[PDB]
Design a protein around this ligand. Structure first.
Ligand SMILES: [Mg+2]
Ligand SMILES: [Mg+2]
Ligand SMILES: [Mg+2]
Ligand SMILES: [Mg+2]
Ligand SMILES: [Mg+2]
Ligand SMILES: [Mg+2]
Ligand SMILES: [Mg+2]
Ligand SMILES: [Mg+2]
Ligand SMILES: [Mg+2]
Ligand SMILES: [Mg+2]
Ligand SMILES: [Mg+2]
Ligand SMILES: [Mg+2]
Ligand SMILES: [Mg+2]
Ligand SMILES: [Mg+2]
Ligand SMILES: [Mg+2]
Ligand SMILES: [Mg+2]
Ligand SMILES: [Mg+2]
Ligand SMILES: [Mg+2]
Ligand SMILES: [Mg+2]
Ligand SMILES: [Mg+2]
Ligand SMILES: [Mg+2]
Ligand SMILES: [Mg+2]
Ligand SMILES: [Mg+2]
Ligand SMILES: [Mg+2]
Ligand SMILES: [Mg+2]
Ligand SMILES: [Mg+2]
Ligand SMILES: [Mg+2]
Ligand SMILES: [Mg+2]
Ligand SMILES: [Mg+2]
Ligand SMILES: [Mg+2]
Ligand SMILES: [Mg+2]
Ligand SMILES: [Mg+2]
Ligand SMILES: [Mg+2]
Ligand SMILES: [Mg+2]
Ligand SMILES: [Mg+2]
Ligand SMILES: [Mg+2]
Ligand SMILES: [Mg+2]
Ligand SMILES: [Mg+2]
Ligand SMILES: [Mg+2]
Ligand SMILES: [Mg+2]
Ligand SMILES: [Mg+2]
Ligand SMILES: [Mg+2]
Ligand SMILES: [Mg+2]
Ligand SMILES: [Mg+2]
Ligand SMILES: [Mg+2]
Ligand SMILES: [Mg+2]
Ligand SMILES: [Mg+2]
Ligand SMILES: [Mg+2]
Ligand SMILES: [Mg+2]
Ligand SMILES: [Mg+2]
Ligand SMILES: [Mg+2]
Ligand SMILES: [Mg+2]
Ligand SMILES: [Mg+2]
Ligand SMILES: [Mg+2]
Ligand SMILES: [Mg+2]
Ligand SMILES: [Mg+2]
Ligand SMILES: [Mg+2]
Ligand SMILES: [Mg+2]
Ligand SMILES: [Mg+2]
Ligand SMILES: [Mg+2]
Ligand SMILES: [Mg+2]
Ligand SMILES: [Mg+2]
Ligand SMILES: [Mg+2]
Lengths: 178, 203, 260
RNA sequence: CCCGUCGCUACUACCGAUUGAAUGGCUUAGUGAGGCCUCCGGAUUGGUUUAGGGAACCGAGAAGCUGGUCAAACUUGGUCAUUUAGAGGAAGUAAAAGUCGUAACAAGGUUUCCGUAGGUGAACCUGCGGAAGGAUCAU
RNA sequence: CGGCACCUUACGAGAAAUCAAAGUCUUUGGGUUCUGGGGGGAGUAUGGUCGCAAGGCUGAAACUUAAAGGAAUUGACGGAAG
RNA sequence: UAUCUGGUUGAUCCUGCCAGUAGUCAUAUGCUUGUCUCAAAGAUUAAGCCAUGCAUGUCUAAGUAUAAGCAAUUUAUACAGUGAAACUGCGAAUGGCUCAUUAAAUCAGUUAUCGUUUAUUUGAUAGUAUACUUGGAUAACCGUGGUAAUUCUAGAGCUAAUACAUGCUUAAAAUCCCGACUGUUUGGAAGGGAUGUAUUUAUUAGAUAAAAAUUUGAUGAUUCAUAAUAACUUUUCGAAUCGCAUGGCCUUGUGCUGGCGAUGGUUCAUUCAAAUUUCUGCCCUAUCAACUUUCGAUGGUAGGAUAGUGGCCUACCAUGGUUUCAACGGGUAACGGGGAAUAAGGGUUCGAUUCCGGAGAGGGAGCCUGAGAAACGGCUACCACAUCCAAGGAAGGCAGCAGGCGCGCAAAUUACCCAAUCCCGACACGGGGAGGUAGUGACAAUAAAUAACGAUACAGGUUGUAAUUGGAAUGAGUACAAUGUAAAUACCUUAACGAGGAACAAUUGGAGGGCAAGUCUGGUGCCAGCAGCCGCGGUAAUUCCAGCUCCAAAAGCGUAUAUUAAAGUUGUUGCAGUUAAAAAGCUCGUAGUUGAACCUUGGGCUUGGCUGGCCGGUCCUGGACCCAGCCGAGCCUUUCCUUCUGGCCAGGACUUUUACUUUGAAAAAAUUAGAGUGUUCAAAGCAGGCCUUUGCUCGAAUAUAUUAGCAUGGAAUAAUAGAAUAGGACGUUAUGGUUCU
């Protein structure tokens, strides 16, 4: 038959289900960023856990090693590109110092709210899901869309959205049309 | 049917091997030709790759070489006198490779007398004496006699081979495989190989 | 099992064809021909995946049935014809001539050549021996048999085939200092000069090759193809990159400068 | 606190006359289909083809026949392996704390325990030799 | 020098009782043999093997169970002492 | 995240297990289920049994057309277009399925064929000592039929070939053999035979250390390639073929010549393969310690057979072969591997299943055809099942696709299509349940709705809510349409419709502890029940049954079983053995394991590179000098480091054996790790990007594999050998002697 298509899990659950310190930290972190559930926090921790694992393996290698220089610079470049890592912290030792709030800062939902396009973080998610927000000239309705540094300046209302110069929506057309 | 596979044997340690697969056609064997002496009967075999083998079931003649003289002639095969593998092949006159046979000596005698001018067997009987003079009195030109005279000195052959011509039958060993090629060919015994088989025959 | 295979699964195809996993279950099984299955490039892959002249396998057959495609100066209508190293592909309708030479990345480059160079090819001598009636002949790497060769030609030499008469123009003896391309192994596509040939009776002879950047590598003699009489003098045009292997960091630096 | 017979209930496994039963593998022996090779055979069917009516003599060739070879399968026997019946016998565990006593834990009222051998409703008792894990690190 | 032991201390070890080895063991590696893997069923059944026998050696499983056990502390009790 | 927590006691510290906890490309099941992408799926039990339908056929100008087929009159009265049926050719040996057997077997990596066969493809390759073109069959067809019945076929009458069977056409010489005659010092010769290529023998070439008294290829290696001689052969094949063009020369005769192709043909090479084959490596078991050898077990000689090697088989002959370094036997709920799950490291468990290899087609066995099959959508027979029958006979093989029964805890449509991927065929055109598309599908995986924002009113510390008041927003769904597609469906786009209880209503488990969240209310009263474990329940139950409230995860959540971590409770890393389980009663002892120290060290000189700087030489970056440091060298120190010829590369002659480690090559793709790349993000995929292109242009990296084998550097560590009755080493040109080429 046809070759199998690869797939993988993008999160991992905690080993201890009930822990007040972790439960309170997660809920506090979900409330700040308007997350739907704990899996959206597990996903960030999971992908951050493997960034650290890659950095740890390179840090065990000797300096000036060809693999450490090549993959280390590439890993740093990718994190700098999405704005998670600062431009003055390109050392692969600051990669280990990253925290989950650094990644949640770069979500589209967080950036819409912090750019003033929404009243609250929860207003940001519904604006995104309802096809009002466009990055560049492309409508993005994924709240977890990680905004790149070069995409930061091009976040705005979609040109065909009621809030961005489009026609009036379904509700208004029914009201002013009666 | 007949199979040449090594799976049915037990291993070098003596362990019986389990049945791995059904018999394959690329490991088959067939049955021996058991070539006899009689009017020629040859059957072809379609072998692997579409090739052809010839079962000589019966043959009368064969191509035999006189190694010392460098001459080959087609001659009748009289019978099998010795077989190093099985004595039952001698009893039943079965022609296989390396079988010691008696062949008609006339084609080689005719070549010898025409080539050298002398005679063979050296028997003293009346017919032998008459034939010896007949060859020596054959009508030849001056050049032919000189050509024969040049070949003289090399015309003296081994005693054990010359002696056989009196009986009109030479000892030979089959070199071809009659069941594989349909030919029953060989060479005339000479030297110490002939001496070896002479002891076997007289015993 | 009971006979020759006639299919080729997509995952089992040679990796240098650069076929995608999900386009289907099967891959073009190269026909029997001058080049081995693993070291060939079927014309269907070349005309559809490389040149993108044909959009699918139905169209490449339409192209070849109009007598457009020539391999080594002869019209081929077999869509899975196994074109290989040093073969010349001519499409006179587009007025294009290609030669199949490995690039340094291990794949068959799309290497366009002039019409004058498309009039010949190189072949590595595999064996020299006597045919029937005592006529010597040479077997090249692409299965060609040339009778009455120059008596100085031996194995591992390279001959220049006229490719229109099939005769030998001239040859290059295998010796130290000759220009070489590697046609097998992980050093496939690299170009350098022979530094030292290390013999191993009963085994595989090894050849030490020095790159133009003074990088030295070792490869089996069976993977060595003499392509020039000395350094910087190849008998065919080399593909872009000149068979010089760059490290991944060097390639990344080169790509950054090329794009700004 | 606690031990063991004995009595009731349930469950598990064991032994057990029945030359028990059933299923599967391997195999001796006997019989042996069929193909293949071989041996003749020669329905009919062409003339090397010759013949003043045609007698030949050349080839092809079906059924069938002879002897081999590979050998399915069956019958009998043996053996191995896996399930399973069984009068009766002897255990273990669980349940409840039913009967008899009080063996152990205090010097447990005869210190206890080990090996061995007898005896005895039951725990157990006794002999011989050990141990202290003793109730003595000592006169 | 070799032994049989003993006294003190605990650098050290140990759950502790205690230990000059039961130390040099998470700062984990001198060499090597044997044995154990919760309590019962059970050193039982079965097979083998040794034995005259008694028995020895080798040796399960089904099933059952939340503890059984080690060392020490306080108390209570003793047909133990003061 | 290299983690632990509850349970033995009146309390304590332990051993130790039980229980809790998390994952599973790990199965089942319960409850629940809105959207997008992706997608496993009758393996487990029964390689059990199967109704029905389909799954393998195939024609170009170029094998054979008098279809009494169609079509048109056309360059055509031999045929000529198209074209059923048949003959011929090829394929049907691929694919697809399944995992029963199978434990040095398969398989993996690594070898070999100087030990063989090979349709086809691709190159070469054939002047060989009636011909203006040979025969007689047969199909389709026509018309006589027989049987209940089949993809049954029989008489009779035709007729063809690239079918079948035969058969000529040719270079120039030259060489060899026999040899009447002749010359007559050994020459000349008329006339006869033989020459290509295959087959089968026998005998010869197939050389190759450098001066004095004519050739000869390859290999590490051959009796190799190849050639020659003498013969041999139920005599191999060296075109009686087919389409398009029709040209050139005149000696204008159906004159002689000739262009591009089809198909075929011998041998060699090549390719696709096949068959054997070297080395090393498999789970449990000793309640398996000896096994193999009648009747092949190990070896030798000869043969037979084979495509070929080989006890593969036969005859004769030896008595061997394996084994505590585990042979042999037994078990496997065992196809092997790439890989999968979990994992700090080391490991443990799994792998029927997308790729590779093997095996099988109900169980055995035997074969035909063919290059290739011991083939089963081929045949023959037996066994077991099983179908039709007019009772005489005939026909079977779903572990292919779909589907049915059965089995079970356990698994989908008797759907559409060759459009893609590819395969097959005489082939641009036909066929393909291979494959693709849709259906079913909570196997797993990705993204991701179930609301957002104001005003009042209050509470509250300039703003977070708690309520009753508004106007906005949107997709779930529905739909014109377009897109998508072979045609559709769906997705993506998008008119009109589509939200206040936004009833367009989120569930699954829990609330004593472990373990997050009640000492609320009602019911029962050691009952009913809960409770993985500890425990709760006998009239105010924080634990049962309910209501309220709350907690956890959420389109998912629980349960059962297996497995992994937790488990340093299998311990090599890394356990324990006085008393918790556990040092044999004590010695000896073979295999195994393990074994004291010691042999070139130090010194000196020159030099290359890279780190820091100083220099600074700064548009972070580059040079000698200087300092140190770190690696590599090369000579000299009494000096290992092979040795000669051409002259560090190429051509010879010698060499103690390992282990170890470095480097290199190899270890298929997929998978893993990982570089690049806005699939709208992501899982993925291997794409893509450029001012918008009658085109330009980065890519599709790279690591890891690891035992075995291969090449290589190093000589510590650990083995091994050497000169003790000297049978020892050097004499390069030491002195003779014996030989051999
Ligand atoms: Mg077995
Ligand atoms: Mg052949
Ligand atoms: Mg194979
Ligand atoms: Mg093809
Ligand atoms: Mg070799
Ligand atoms: Mg009976
Ligand atoms: Mg029998
Ligand atoms: Mg058994
Ligand atoms: Mg008492
Ligand atoms: Mg008393
Ligand atoms: Mg007492
Ligand atoms: Mg008593
Ligand atoms: Mg301590
Ligand atoms: Mg003490
Ligand atoms: Mg002591
Ligand atoms: Mg136990
Ligand atoms: Mg106690
Ligand atoms: Mg206790
Ligand atoms: Mg208590
Ligand atoms: Mg557990
Ligand atoms: Mg679980
Ligand atoms: Mg089914
Ligand atoms: Mg399946
Ligand atoms: Mg017609
Ligand atoms: Mg073909
Ligand atoms: Mg297959
Ligand atoms: Mg075994
Ligand atoms: Mg050819
Ligand atoms: Mg007829
Ligand atoms: Mg023919
Ligand atoms: Mg032999
Ligand atoms: Mg032999
Ligand atoms: Mg024998
Ligand atoms: Mg397995
Ligand atoms: Mg199995
Ligand atoms: Mg498998
Ligand atoms: Mg199975
Ligand atoms: Mg497979
Ligand atoms: Mg079946
Ligand atoms: Mg069958
Ligand atoms: Mg079969
Ligand atoms: Mg079938
Ligand atoms: Mg089949
Ligand atoms: Mg069917
Ligand atoms: Mg899902
Ligand atoms: Mg809802
Ligand atoms: Mg609820
Ligand atoms: Mg409940
Ligand atoms: Mg409740
Ligand atoms: Mg709590
Ligand atoms: Mg529960
Ligand atoms: Mg308790
Ligand atoms: Mg109450
Ligand atoms: Mg109550
Ligand atoms: Mg475990
Ligand atoms: Mg332990
Ligand atoms: Mg005790
Ligand atoms: Mg104990
Ligand atoms: Mg002791
Ligand atoms: Mg030592
Ligand atoms: Mg020189
Ligand atoms: Mg790989
Ligand atoms: Mg290795």
């Amino acid at each position: 038959p046809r070759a199998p298509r690869t797939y993988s899990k993008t999160y991992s659950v905690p080993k201890r289900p009930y822990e007040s310190a972790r439960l309170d930290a997660e809920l506090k972190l979900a409330g700040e960023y308007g997350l739907k559930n704990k899996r959206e926090i597990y996903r960030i921790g999971f992908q951050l856990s493997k960034i650290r694992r890659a950095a740890r393996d390179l840090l065990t290698r000797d300096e000036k090693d060809p693999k450490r220089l090549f993959e280390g610079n590439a890993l740093i470049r990718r994190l700098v590109r999405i704005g998670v890592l600062s431009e003055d912290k390109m050392k692969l030792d600051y990669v280990l110092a990253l925290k989950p709030e650094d990644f949640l800062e770069r979500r589209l939902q967080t950036q819409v709210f912090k750019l003033g396009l929404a009243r609250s973080i929860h207003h940001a998610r519904v604006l995104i899901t309802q096809r009002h927000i466009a990055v560049g000239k492309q409508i993005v309705n994924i709240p977890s869309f990680t905004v790149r540094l070069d995409s930061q300046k091009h976040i705005d209302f979609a040109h065909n959205s009621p809030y961005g110069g489009g026609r009036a929506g379904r509700v208004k057309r029914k009201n002013q049309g009666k | 049917g007949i199979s040449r596979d090594s799976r049915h044997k037990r291993s070098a340690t003596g362990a019986k091997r389990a049945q791995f697969r059904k018999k394959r056609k690329f490991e088959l064997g067939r049955q021996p030709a058991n070539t006899k002496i009689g009017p020629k009967r040859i059957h072809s075999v379609r072998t692997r790759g579409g090739n052809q083998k010839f079962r000589a079931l019966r043959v009368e003649t064969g191509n035999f070489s006189w190694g010392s003289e460098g001459v080959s002639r087609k001659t009748r095969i009289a019978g099998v006198v010795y077989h190093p593998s099985n004595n039952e092949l001698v009893r039943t006159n079965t022609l296989t490779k390396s079988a010691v046979v008696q062949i008609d000596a006339t084609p080689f005698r005719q070549w010898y007398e025409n080539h050298y001018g002398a005679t063979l067997g050296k028997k003293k009987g009346g017919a032998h004496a008459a034939h010896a003079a007949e060859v020596a009195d054959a009508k030849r030109s001056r050049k032919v006699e000189r050509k024969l005279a040049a070949r003289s000195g090399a015309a003296a052959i081994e005693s054990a081979v010359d002696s056989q011509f009196g009986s009109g039958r030479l000892y030979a060993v089959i070199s071809s495989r009659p069941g594989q090629s349909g030919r029953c060919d060989g060479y005339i015994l000479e030297g110490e190989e002939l001496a070896f088989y002479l002891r076997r025959l007289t015993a | 099992a009971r006979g020759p295979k006639k299919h080729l699964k997509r995952l089992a195809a040679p990796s240098h064809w650069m076929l995608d996993k999900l386009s289907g279950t099967y891959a073009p099984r190269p026909s029997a021909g001058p080049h081995k299955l693993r070291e060939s490039l079927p014309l269907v892959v070349f005309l559809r995946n490389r040149l993108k002249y044909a959009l699918n396998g139905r169209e490449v057959k339409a192209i070849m049935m109009q007598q457009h495609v020539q391999v080594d100066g002869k019209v081929r209508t077999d869509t899975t014809y196994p074109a290989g190293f040093m073969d010349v592909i001519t499409l006179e309708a587009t007025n294009e001539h290609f030669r199949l030479v490995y690039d340094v990345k291990g794949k068959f480059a799309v290497h366009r050549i002039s019409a004058e160079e498309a009039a010949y090819k190189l072949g590595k001598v595999k064996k020299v021996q006597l045919g029937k009636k005592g006529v010597p002949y040479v077997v090249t790497h692409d299965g060609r048999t040339i009778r009455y060769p120059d008596p100085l030609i031996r194995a591992n030499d390279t001959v220049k085939i006229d490719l229109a008469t099939g005769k030998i123009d001239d040859f290059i003896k295998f010796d130290t200092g000759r220009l070489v391309m590697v046609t097998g192994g992980r050093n496939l596509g690299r170009v350098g000069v022979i530094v030292h040939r290390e013999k191993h009776e009963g085994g595989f002879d090894l050849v030490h090759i020095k790159d133009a950047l003074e990088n030295t590598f070792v490869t089996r003699l069976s993977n060595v193809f003499v392509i020039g009489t000395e350094a910087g003098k190849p008998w065919v045009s080399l593909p872009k990159g000149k068979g010089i292997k760059l490290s991944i960091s060097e390639e990344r630096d080169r790509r950054r400068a090329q794009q700004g």
